[PDB]
Amino acid sequence: DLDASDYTGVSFWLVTAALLASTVFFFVERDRVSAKWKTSLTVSGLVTGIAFWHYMYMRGVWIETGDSPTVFRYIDWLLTVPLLICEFYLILAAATNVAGSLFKKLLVGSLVMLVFGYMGEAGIMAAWPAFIIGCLAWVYMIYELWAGEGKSACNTASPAVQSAYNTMMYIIIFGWAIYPVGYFTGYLNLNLIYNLADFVNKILFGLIIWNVAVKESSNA
Amino acid sequence: MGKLLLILGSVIALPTFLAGGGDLDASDYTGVSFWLVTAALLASTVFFFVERDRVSAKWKTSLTVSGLVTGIAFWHYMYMRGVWIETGDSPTVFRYIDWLLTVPLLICEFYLILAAATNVAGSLFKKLLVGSLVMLVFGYMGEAGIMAAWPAFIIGCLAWVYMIYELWAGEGKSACNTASPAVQSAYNTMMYIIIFGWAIYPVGYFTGYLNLNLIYNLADFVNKILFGLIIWNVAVKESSNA
Amino acid sequence: DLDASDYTGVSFWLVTAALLASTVFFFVERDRVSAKWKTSLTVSGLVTGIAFWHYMYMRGVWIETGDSPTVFRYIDWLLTVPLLICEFYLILAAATNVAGSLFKKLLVGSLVMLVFGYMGEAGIMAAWPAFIIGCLAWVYMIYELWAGEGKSACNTASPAVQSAYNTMMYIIIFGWAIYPVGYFTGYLNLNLIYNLADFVNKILFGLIIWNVAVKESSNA
Amino acid sequence: DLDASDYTGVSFWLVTAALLASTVFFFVERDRVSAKWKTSLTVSGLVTGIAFWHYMYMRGVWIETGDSPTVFRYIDWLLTVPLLICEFYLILAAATNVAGSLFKKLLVGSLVMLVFGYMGEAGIMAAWPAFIIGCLAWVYMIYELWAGEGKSACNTASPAVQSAYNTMMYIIIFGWAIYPVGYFTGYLNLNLIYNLADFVNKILFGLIIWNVAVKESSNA
Amino acid sequence: DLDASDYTGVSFWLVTAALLASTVFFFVERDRVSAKWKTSLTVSGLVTGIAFWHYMYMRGVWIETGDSPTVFRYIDWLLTVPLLICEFYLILAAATNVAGSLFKKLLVGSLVMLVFGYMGEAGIMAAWPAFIIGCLAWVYMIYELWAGEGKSACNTASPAVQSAYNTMMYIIIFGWAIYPVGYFTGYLNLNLIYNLADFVNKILFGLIIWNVAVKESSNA
Amino acid sequence: MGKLLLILGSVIALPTFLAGGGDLDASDYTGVSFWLVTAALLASTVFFFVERDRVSAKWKTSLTVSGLVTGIAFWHYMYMRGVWIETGDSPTVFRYIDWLLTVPLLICEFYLILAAATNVAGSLFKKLLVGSLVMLVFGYMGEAGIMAAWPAFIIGCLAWVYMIYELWAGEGKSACNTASPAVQSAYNTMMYIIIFGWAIYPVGYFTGYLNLNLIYNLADFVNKILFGLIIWNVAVKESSNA
Ligand SMILES: *C/C=C(C)/C=C/C=C(C)/C=C/C1=C(C)CCCC1(C)C
Ligand SMILES: *C/C=C(C)/C=C/C=C(C)/C=C/C1=C(C)CCCC1(C)C
Ligand SMILES: *C/C=C(C)/C=C/C=C(C)/C=C/C1=C(C)CCCC1(C)C
Ligand SMILES: *C/C=C(C)/C=C/C=C(C)/C=C/C1=C(C)CCCC1(C)C
Ligand SMILES: *C/C=C(C)/C=C/C=C(C)/C=C/C1=C(C)CCCC1(C)C
Ligand SMILES: *C/C=C(C)/C=C/C=C(C)/C=C/C1=C(C)CCCC1(C)C
């Protein structure tokens, strides 16, 4: 690529290599954890692998044409956000008892939010109603994960699990807020911001989950 | 492990064969749905072939069968995507091949769980398989134009309702009576999936005889990933006791 | 492949996909079975894998030329029938003690029968003597596994192994009879029948072996 | 390929598929045997894999030109015969005590025999002296494996090991005799004979070794 | 590549092959170490693998154009320095208890230092302020791992872990100093020095970590 | 295992990349030797990476190091075969790269076995490594034409004799004094290999300064496969005790 002229290709290569490394990382570290946490690593590994695959496709499209195919980004979000938000249910199940409806509501909210976001970007619906519905679904998920069943499950957990849950909640609140900001900016230079946001929300989340899994399983 | 790293590298290099099929954005929902479903099916295949570590020896089959389902789906979906790129027409033949090679395994999942959790004669699996084969044969005859749309659709709906009744008040209820609560909940969820999840197919079919590919994609997504996830959940919940 | 015009391509695709699925199934399910029956599954997996390989080659030939490449079919039979017929010896060794001459005589009979069938197909010898020799070898193997050493070994076995042996004997008697029937029909519309017969004799056989292996091993 | 017109391509495909199947077979069956016999299977798997690789290369050369590149055959023999003849030392070590010089003498004799055979075929030396030296090395190996240190090691062994050793000795005496016969015939229609001889001496040998390994390790 | 004309290609080939060998070595040697140290080897293997990937890309660029693609070098540094510097946190966690802020501050310092180095290289900001900021971050990390939290954690550790920590600290102080020296030389014949430095800092570091991990685990 | 069968299939499909380099029969002994050595090195790499199951935790390193030796040799041999096919000239640079990346591991095998079997300071490994590096540098200078053939050859022979003496009556003898008889026999065999097996290189080198590629191929074959087999034999003999 070019040198000191473009920051898009550098970000693409950096994120692709990081995602491949994290995928290998998480598919190899499944040997350390116990039987309970051999899923909280597999799901994160799948998240990073799917993100890496779609990043390779986006890099190919960028080489073919110098534009931003946000449809690929929405495909990647639609197959990663459900798993990332399910990670909460997975760690709560591997750490304590969960009724099961938390996963259902989590998944439904995430699917509705993305579908509406994709429809708003593609122009099927007006931008404002789609943005409002997506924000409402996001706030509903935050409320469920902050003061609803998620908080109740987090109350009965070991201190390491509680700290990891708080870190993941902060990540959801702050790092995930970049994408709606970019959506509002585009409906009223972004590829690099999305790359960095995916880097954070796809590597730090998995590393937090791996840390808590190793710290819990080490007991034995 | 370094040998396991070879497996990881092979899994990573498999998408490279798929150079990419994208062509238009925000114009056609078929190609987007095809890629979404293909990637989700590959991810679920890897998930189910990896999560066999947790389950005990009794439930190491209930994951492999679902992994096979998703893998066969993924294979036939690539084929379908290739055909669609070559020609923008309905790949009915490939869809019915995929259904014929996947519905038997999905309906055999019932027998597998009812045998690994309790004792069952298994005649429910045989009769449901026969009903599903009849429904699939009638659907292909209708799609091929041999029979009219309305009679074939009515016969398929009647066969599907039969299968639902067999799953609700047939031998399935008796088998579910002597089982753990987790297996009962899994059976109820799978019965609800049969009632509603499979019901996406005929309604979408009625859409095509009165677009269809998107509905079929979404229906395959649901009834091949949610089913496997429910089976995995019940298998893990049962095997953890060990 | 043509759609709604010929069932040969549909049968080819169906039995290719089913054979690949059965290969993966049999090479993955070796974990459940004990150390005794880790061979009764590997050989079945090899049978299905070789069938899938030769089926891909036959599909390529059919696409290249629309005829009947029976040479590849006889190669597939020559490399799959010995393993399917040695499955009897394998399950008998895993269930009881067998001298070993049963496998030798089975292999010799199966190889002689196929070679004679191939020679009859190719026209090296007269069709009727080759057909008679093949039928005689088939009946000799049936007698050996019905009233000879195979039956004697089956007498001293667990009920599950005996039931599997009876089911496999019934499959050998009935399903395998399609191929000599096709040979007689062609030496006195077929590829579909052969495909279905391969599906049956290469998947149901392996599934019976897997079922009996799992039933035997799990007990412990 | 052609149908009922050539028997070379059929033999090539048959042997290649059989060698690939046997390679997979032996690399998978290492899980059944104990720690002692996890080498007697690896070496046979390597033999079949190398033979399969060189058979693929020979098939490619045959497609390129319809002739017999015996240099490839001698390369395959030079990297398979040492391992096959070492299999004796490996099973004797895994079954009883071996001094170690048996391997040395075995390997030296096999290397000398092939090198002289290759030189005679390539015309570096006269055919008769090379044939005489190769036959002398072969007879020396047979004597060592029949009445020398090999027989002494076979005397102190379990009956299964003794039977396997006798079977391997008979294979060495009879099946390996095909190659010098073909060499004499060509230095005074052969590719098919060499294919079949490799089939036997590369599959039956490994199957005998696997049989004795499984029968020994089953004890535990 | 030219022979006896330029040492850049020789260095590229040497450090590519060595990095691949070290990657395989570190991903294979995870079997020996216990469950505590199955992470240090994994991270070292990831470091070497990413280095090998970016080295292959840099070799391709060099063949395509005979210049210095320092952008790829800084991508490699940005994706490898955080892991090498978190190896300290990993070994400290595997040997004793660490709060976790050490890894956070290490990562922040390393990322800030490179980003500033990349900006100085690209000319986004003035070279001297970026060099000063990078040196300040480097000295801050050295102080943290020499007299701060890292030293305090190293005080309560086994003698082997303390010796490994001292060796790694010496490597950080000495071998890593090549890169700022090269930057000063170029901002006030190099690729060979950088290659050798990468060889050292990416192989000797991992070998020290592997040695201490094996020494700790085998005890048990 | 099916996942293991993926590794087996990858190993089987690796030779497919190598389409084939054969050109002439009974005319040149270089290409034949190249193919023989490449295939033997790949086989030994697979053998040493598979046989780690038998050896105990102490000797699971003495096999991995030899496997990498053979793997690096195989990689550089392919490169050398490609260069030779492109141009029929001596690949001196690749040979010295391979030597520089393999001789250190082969000489480190001594330290590895003397540490996994008994206690040794390890200065013998360091001094032998320094001597080998000096010998390789002198050989590279002689081959590049910087120095004359006779002085470089004499210096290399003197360094090699030094290394032999260090292996005979240096720290190696003291380390071998306190060891099991199997380790002593392995050390004697490796010392004999150093004395005679490596001696193929200088004499063949003297052949090139007074073909060479065939001698170097055979020498690499011996000193990289027999060495690994001796290490594997001693490792298995020691670890079986468990
Ligand atoms: C790896 C990718 C991740 C974690 C993506 C997350 C994306 C979101 C949270 C997107 C949210 C949106 C809204 C809340 C409303 C407007 C539309 C979206 C899709 C931009
Ligand atoms: C993986 C694919 C699956 C589970 C496909 C399921 C398909 C059906 C349940 C189709 C049903 C139909 C009827 C009930 C009647 C009308 C015709 C069909 C074939 C569309
Ligand atoms: C997977 C393929 C299988 C099980 C093939 C089986 C084939 C036979 C049993 C063929 C039998 C024949 C005779 C009994 C006589 C006439 C010639 C044959 C080869 C058609
Ligand atoms: C898989 C290949 C095998 C077992 C090849 C074996 C080859 C021989 C035993 C060849 C022997 C020869 C002589 C005894 C003398 C004349 C020359 C040879 C090479 C043909
Ligand atoms: C494998 C690569 C490694 C270990 C790279 C290390 C790089 C550095 C320590 C770079 C340091 C720099 C400074 C301390 C200041 C000036 C800018 C840099 C990036 C050259
Ligand atoms: C895998 C490669 C190996 C073990 C290479 C070994 C090479 C040598 C021992 C080379 C030795 C030389 C001398 C002793 C003096 C003359 C020059 C050399 C480099 C040919």
Numbering used by the authors:
A (entry chain B), C (entry chain F), D (entry chain E), E (entry chain C): 23 to 210, 219 to 250
B (entry chain A), F (entry chain D): 1 to 210, 219 to 250
Study text:
Microbial ion-pumping rhodopsins (MRs) are extensively studied retinal-binding membrane proteins. The green-light absorbing proteorhodopsin (GPR) was originally discovered in marine γ-proteobacteria as the first bacterial rhodopsin and as an example of a new type of bacterial phototrophy. The bacterial green-light absorbing proton pump proteorhodopsin (GPR) has emerged as a model protein for MRs and is used here to address these open questions using cryo-electron microscopy (cryo-EM) and molecular dynamics (MD) simulations. GPR possesses an N-terminal signal sequence, akin to numerous membrane proteins, that is hypothesised to guide the correct insertion of the protein into the plasma membrane before subsequent proteolytic removal.
To this end, we expressed the GPR-A18L variant, introducing an alanine to leucine substitution (A18L) known to prevent cleavage of the signal peptide in the blue-light absorbing proteorhodopsin (BPR) when expressed in E. coli. Upon careful examination of the hexameric GPR map, two α-helical densities were identified in the central cavity, challenging the initially assumed C6 symmetry and revealing a C2 symmetry instead. If two signal peptides occupy the space that will form the central cavity of the oligomer, this expands the diameter and thus permits the assembly of six protomers. This includes a hydrogen bond formed between the two serine residues at position 10 and a salt bridge between K3 and D53 on TMH A. In total, these additional interactions, formed by the signal peptides with neighbouring protomers, account for an increased oligomerisation interface area compared to the pentamer of around 1400 Å2 (about 25% more), as calculated by PISA30. Interestingly, protomers 1 and 4 exhibit slight differences compared to the other protomers, likely due to the interaction of their signal peptides in the centre of the hexamer.
